[PDB]
C-alpha cells in the first residue's frame, strides 16, 4: 500500500497547496527574472577584397576596426576596379563592435541569407547549388593573431523563387530565398569569432555557376542569453539537492521493507533517476571548458527522461489492472514498451547523424543532400509511427483499466474490509494519478502552443513578463514537482 | 563552280534528326517537328522544321564543312512560312564558327553573322543583318521590312569581297549597299585622326555551324530550303527551283482552303439564325 491511500483529504490538500505554491514560483522565476531564452543578431557581411595577398599563406580579412579590409560598398564597384570573383571574401565578425561572446551563451547557431538580384540574362538555374569556401577563426583579445577553428567547403542548394513579373521594369529585385542552415557549435569558449566566406567560380567543374547575381550575404547568429543561462543554473542548483534528498528517502523507504519492491516502485525510482540526471548541472562545467558536445548530451538527457516518462505511464496503467494482472515482471510489458524503445533508438540515431557529426564539422547538416533528407525523414517517420502505436496502446490500456474498475465496484460490498480498503485505495491511486497527469500534460501542451504563437513577451503594468522563458521554467518546475509528488505519495506505507 | 557550303531539303524524311543537334543549355527549350503545315505546295518538298510549343525558346543547329569567305562571295539563303502569324517571334538564322559547342547554344552564343526576319509587336517587323566584327555586333542601319502573311517567303543575303552586299527576298532585290556604309564598323571619317580603313570586314576565318536560336510566343512557323554557298547564281536558281515552283500550287491550296472556310462560316451563320 502506498502513502496516498492512507492520507486524509486535509493532508492531500496541504501537499497540493505547497506544490501549487512552488509551481507559481517556478513560473514567476522565468516570467519576471529571466531575460528570454535566445537572442538573434543579424549580421551583414562586409565584401572584403583580396588584392592577391592570400597566395600561399592564409590571410584573415577583418570587417572593421584596426587592420580593416579593403571593401566594396556595393558589388557593382568590382567591375570598374576589374576585381574578379574568387577575391571577394564576405567577412563577418561575430561579436558586433565593442561586445564580447561569453561561455554563458551556451551555443552559437548560425544561418545564412543570400540577397540574389533578379537579372534577365543572369537568372538562377533550375537546380542551382552554392558551394561556399568557408573559413572560421577565434580570438581571445583584440591584439592577438586569429587562430583557425574550421575550414570546410559548404555546398547548399538554393530554394529561391521570384514573385514579381519577369520584366526589365522589375529587374534588380531580390529573389525570395529560404534561409540556409550554416553551422552550430555547442560551445562559445572564445570571445571573438571571424568568419570568411568565398564563392569561387569554375565553369569546367561547375562550381558556383548559375547561382544568380548575389549582392549580399547576411548571417544571423542565435545564442542563449547569459541571463537566462544564469537563471536556469540557479533553478537547477535549487532542484538538484531536493531531488537527491527525496531520492535517498524513497530508496530507504523501498529497501527496508519486509518484502522486495514491486515493478511499479522500481519504475518510479527509474523515473526519479532519469530526472536527477537532468537536474545535475554539468553544463556549469561548460563555462570553464570547451566541450562542444554539450548540446548532444543535453538532448540525450531530455530524450531519456521522455522515454522513461512514457514508459512509466504504460507501466502504471498495466499495474493498475484490477483482475488477473499486475505481474511484477518487466518482460510482460515488451508489447507496450517496445514502441518507446524503437522510437527512442530512431531519434537517437537521427540526433547522432545530425548533431553527432557536427562535432567534427560545424557546417555539416544532414539535410544538404537528398539521400540525407530521405534518411532523416525515415527515422523521424518511424519515430512518429512508434509514438502513434504507443498512444493507441495507452488509450486501450486506460480504457481497459476503467472497465476493470467499473466491473470491480459492484462486487466490493461482498468482500472483507481489508480487501475493500485495498481495492478502494488502488482505485483512488489510479484516478488521482491519471487526473494529475492529464492536468500536467494539458497545461504543458497549452503553454507550448501559447509560447509558439505569442510574440514572446507581454507588457502589463510596470513590468514585462517573458512568456517564452516562463514556459521553460514553469514546465521544468512542473515536471520536477510531478516527480516529487509521484515519489512521495506513491512510496510504500508501513503498517502499525 | 558551285561551292555548296551547306544545303538541305529534308527529302529523306528523317535527316533533320541526324544533321541538326538540339541544344540542352536550358531544360525548357522548345522542340522542332518536321511537318508540311496545314497548307503547302508540295507534301514532301515543303516539309520543314516547325515550332510546336507556345511561349518557348528554340535552339537547334546543323554543322557543315568549315570554310572561309576571304576573297570569295558569300551567300546565305532560306525560306520561312509563318502558319500562325506571330505577334512576336524570330525567324532568323545564325552562323557560328566550328568552335561553338552545339549542345550548349543559347541566346547569348557568339555568332558570326545573324540574318533573317524578326517580328515582335506591330512596332518591329524588320530583317536583321548583324555582323560580329571586332567584338561589336553591329546591326544594319537601313530598315528592311519583312513579310508577314502565312505564305512561304524566301530570304537571301549576299556579301561580296568588294564590301558590297544585297538582300534578296522572294528571289527579288529588297536592299543593297556596302558594308562600311550601312554599319558602324569603322570610326566616322570626319579627316578624323582616329580613322583607318579596313577592307577585311567581310572576311571570316571559318564558318562551321548554322543554328536556329529564336523566341516565339506563337509557335507554328516552318523553316525550309537552307543554302550556304559562294555562288549568287546557284542561290538564285535554287530559290526558283524550290520556292518559285511550289509558289503557284501553295497559293492555289491556300485559296481553296480559305474558300472552304468562308463557305463553312457563311453557311454556319445562315443556319444559326
Amino acid at each position: 500500500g502506498a502513502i496516498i491511500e492512507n492520507m486524509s483529504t486535509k493532508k492531500l490538500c496541504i501537499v497540493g497547496g505547497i506544490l501549487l505554491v512552488f509551481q507559481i514560483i517556478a513560473f514567476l522565476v522565468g516570467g519576471l527574472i529571466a531575460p528570454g531564452p535566445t537572442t538573434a543578431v543579424s549580421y551583414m557581411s562586409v565584401k572584403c577584397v583580396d588584392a592577391r595577398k592570400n597566395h600561399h599563406k592564409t590571410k584573415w580579412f577583418v570587417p572593421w576596426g584596426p587592420n580593416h579590409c579593403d571593401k566594396i560598398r556595393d558589388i557593382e564597384e568590382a567591375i570598374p576596379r576589374e576585381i574578379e570573383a574568387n577575391d571577394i571574401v564576405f567577412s563577418v565578425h561575430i561579436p558586433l563592435p565593442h561586445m564580447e561572446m561569453s561561455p554563458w551563451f551556451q551555443f552559437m547557431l548560425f544561418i545564412l541569407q543570400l540577397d540574389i538580384a533578379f537579372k534577365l540574362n543572369n537568372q538562377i538555374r533550375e537546380n542551382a547549388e552554392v558551394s561556399m569556401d568557408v573559413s572560421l577563426a577565434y580570438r581571445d583579445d583584440a591584439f592577438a593573431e586569429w587562430t583557425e577553428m574550421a575550414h570546410e567547403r559548404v555546398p547548399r542548394k538554393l530554394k529561391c523563387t521570384f514573385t514579381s513579373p519577369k520584366t526589365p521594369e522589375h529587374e534588380g529585385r531580390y529573389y525570395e530565398c529560404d534561409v540556409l542552415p550554416f553551422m552550430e557549435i555547442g560551445s562559445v569558449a572564445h570571445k571573438f569569432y571571424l568568419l570568411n566566406i568565398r564563392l569561387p567560380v569554375n565553369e569546367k567543374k561547375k562550381i558556383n555557376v548559375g547561382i544568380g547575381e548575389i549582392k549580399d550575404i547576411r548571417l544571423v547568429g542565435i545564442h542563449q542569453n547569459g541571463g537566462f543561462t544564469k537563471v536556469w543554473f540557479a533553478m537547477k542548483t535549487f532542484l538538484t539537492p531536493s531531488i537527491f534528498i527525496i531520492m535517498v528517502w524513497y530508496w530507504r523507504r523501498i529497501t527496508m521493507m519486509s518484502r522486495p519492491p514491486v515493478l511499479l516502485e522500481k519504475v518510479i525510482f527509474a523515473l526519479g533517476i532519469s530526472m536527477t540526471f537532468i537536474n545535475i548541472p554539468v553544463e556549469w562545467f561548460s563555462i570553464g571548458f570547451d566541450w562542444t558536445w554539450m548540446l548532444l548530451f543535453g538532448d540525450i538527457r531530455q530524450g531519456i527522461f521522455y522515454a522513461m516518462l512514457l514508459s512509466f505511464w504504460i507501466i502504471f496503467c498495466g499495474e493498475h489492472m484490477m483482475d488477473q494482472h499486475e505481474r511484477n515482471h518487466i518482460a510482460g510489458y515488451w508489447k507496450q514498451v517496445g514502441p518507446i524503445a524503437v522510437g527512442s533508438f530512431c531519434l537517437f540515431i537521427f540526433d547522432m547523424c545530425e548533431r553527432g557529426v557536427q562535432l567534427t564539422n560545424p557546417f555539416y547538416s544532414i539535410w544538404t543532400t537528398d539521400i540525407g533528407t530521405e534518411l532523416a525523414m525515415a527515422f523521424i517517420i518511424v519515430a512518429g509511427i512508434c509514438l502513434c502505436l504507443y498512444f493507441l496502446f495507452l488509450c486501450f490500456m486506460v480504457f481497459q483499466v476503467f472497465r476493470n474498475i467499473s466491473g470491480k465496484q459492484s462486487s466490493l460490498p461482498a468482500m472483507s474490509k481489508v480487501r475493500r480498503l485495498h481495492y478502494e485505495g488502488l482505485i483512488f491511486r489510479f484516478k488521482f494519478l491519471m487526473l494529475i497527469t492529464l492536468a500536467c500534460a494539458a497545461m504543458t501542451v497549452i503553454f507550448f502552443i501559447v509560447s509558439q504563437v505569442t510574440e514572446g513577451h507581454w507588457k502589463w503594468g510596470g513590468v514585462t513578463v517573458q512568456v517564452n522563458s516562463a514556459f521553460f521554467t514553469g514546465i521544468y518546475g512542473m515536471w520536477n514537482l510531478y516527480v516529487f509528488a509521484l515519489m512521495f505519495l506513491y512510496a510504500p506505507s508501513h503498517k502499525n | 563552280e558551285p561551292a555548296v557550303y551547306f544545303k538541305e531539303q529534308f527529302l529523306d524524311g528523317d535527316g533533320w534528326t541526324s544533321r541538326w543537334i538540339e541544344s540542352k543549355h536550358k531544360s525548357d527549350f522548345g522542340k522542332f517537328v518536321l511537318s508540311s503545315g496545314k497548307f503547302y505546295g508540295d507534301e514532301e518538298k515543303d516539309k520543314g522544321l516547325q515550332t510546336s510549343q507556345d511561349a518557348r525558346f528554340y535552339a537547334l543547329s546543323a554543322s557543315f564543312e568549315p570554310f572561309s569567305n576571304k576573297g570569295q562571295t558569300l551567300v546565305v539563303q532560306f525560306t520561312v512560312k509563318h502558319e500562325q502569324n506571330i505577334d512576336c517571334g524570330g525567324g532568323y538564322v545564325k552562323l557560328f564558327p566550328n568552335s561553338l559547342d552545339q549542345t550548349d547554344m543559347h541566346g547569348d552564343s557568339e555568332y558570326n553573322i545573324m540574318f533573317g526576319p524578326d517580328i515582335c509587336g506591330p512596332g518591329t517587323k524588320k530583317v536583321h543583318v548583324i555582323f560580329n566584327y571586332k567584338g561589336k555586333n553591329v546591326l544594319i542601319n537601313k530598315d528592311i521590312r519583312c513579310k508577314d502573311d502565312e505564305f512561304t517567303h524566301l530570304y537571301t543575303l549576299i556579301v561580296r569581297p568588294d564590301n558590297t552586299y544585297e538582300v534578296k527576298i522572294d528571289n527579288s532585290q529588297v536592299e543593297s549597299g556596302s558594308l562600311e556604309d550601312d554599319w558602324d564598323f569603322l570610326p566616322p571619317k570626319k579627316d578624323n585622326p582616329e580613322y583607318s580603313p579596313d577592307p577585311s570586314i567581310y572576311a571570316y576565318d571559318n564558318f562551321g555551324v548554322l543554328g536556329l536560336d529564336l523566341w516565339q510566343v506563337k509557335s507554328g512557323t516552318i523553316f525550309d530550303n537552307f543554302l550556304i554557298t559562294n555562288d549568287e547564281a546557284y542561290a538564285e536558281e535554287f530559290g526558283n527551283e524550290t520556292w518559285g515552283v511550289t509558289k503557284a500550287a501553295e497559293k492555289q491550296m491556300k485559296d481553296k482552303q480559305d474558300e472552304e472556310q468562308r463557305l463553312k462560316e457563311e453557311e454556319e451563320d445562315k443556319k444559326r439564325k
Partner: protein, 301 residues
Amino acid sequence: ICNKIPGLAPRQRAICQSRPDAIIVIGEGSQMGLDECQFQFRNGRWNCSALGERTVFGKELKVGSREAAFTYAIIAAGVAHAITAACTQGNLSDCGCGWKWGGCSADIRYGIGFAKVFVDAREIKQNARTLMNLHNNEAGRKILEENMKLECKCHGVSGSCTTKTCWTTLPQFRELGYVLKDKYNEAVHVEPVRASRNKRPTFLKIKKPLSYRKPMDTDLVYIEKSPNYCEEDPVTGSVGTQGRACNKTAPQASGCDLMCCGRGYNTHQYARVWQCNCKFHWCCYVKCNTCSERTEMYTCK
C-alpha cells in the same frame, strides 16, 4: 561637420554634434529615398526631379500634393532603413546596445527612433503643411515597420520546435518603393480643422466626400491639388517636360502625346551601344559584345 551641410534645421545640426557618425548614414538614407522616388516616377510628368539644387533632404515641394506626400514618406523610410542597415554591418557601434544579460534591443527600434527624432525636427513652422509632412513621415516609417520580413528557426531538442528564435529583417528598398507607390496611387485628400480656442489647427480630417474621420496613420495624405507638371512655373514648383524622353505610343503617361501635353516629339538618331551577348559569373566577370544600333529616341518639344 554639419557646418558645411546645407538645409539642416538648427536642432538637427546639434544632433550632428551628438552623433557625427550617424549624420553620414542619414544623408545616405535621404539620398536612397530620393533615388527610389526618382526611379518610381521616372515615367511620369513629375520625375521626382524638381530638385534643381542639392540639399540633404531634397528641395521642398511648394505644393503639398500627392507627390510631396510620396517624397516625404520615402525620405523618412529611407533614413530609418539606412540607419538600421548601417547598424547591422558594424558601421555604427553605439546602435543597439546589458549585452550579456538580454542581448540588446531590436535594431529596427533604434533605427526608427533616431530617424524619427531627426526627420520630424525639420518641420519647424507649425502649419497645416507641417501636419501633412508629419503625417506622411509617420506613414512612411509605419510602412517600413509593416514590411519587415519576419523569420523563425526551430532549434530545440533534436532540432524540433521545442525552442525557436524569431527575428525581423529589413525589406530591400525597391520593394518598399513599390509599396509606397501603391500608397501614392490611392492617397486621400485631407483638410485641416481649426479650433477657435486654440487659434491654430492641430489635427486634420479627410476632405474626400462621404467621410469626416481622421486618416489612418499608415495612409499618405495631401492638402493641395496637383499641378500640371508639364509647363515650367516656379510659382507652383513645376519643372516642365521640355526635352524629356517619350515612347510615342498609346500607353498612358509615357506616350509622347501625354508626356509633352500635346507639344509633339523630337528625334535625333541616338545610336545606342547596347552591350549584349555576355557570359556571366555571379558578380564580376563580363566578356560581352556591344551590339550597337542606330535607334531613334524621341524627346518632348
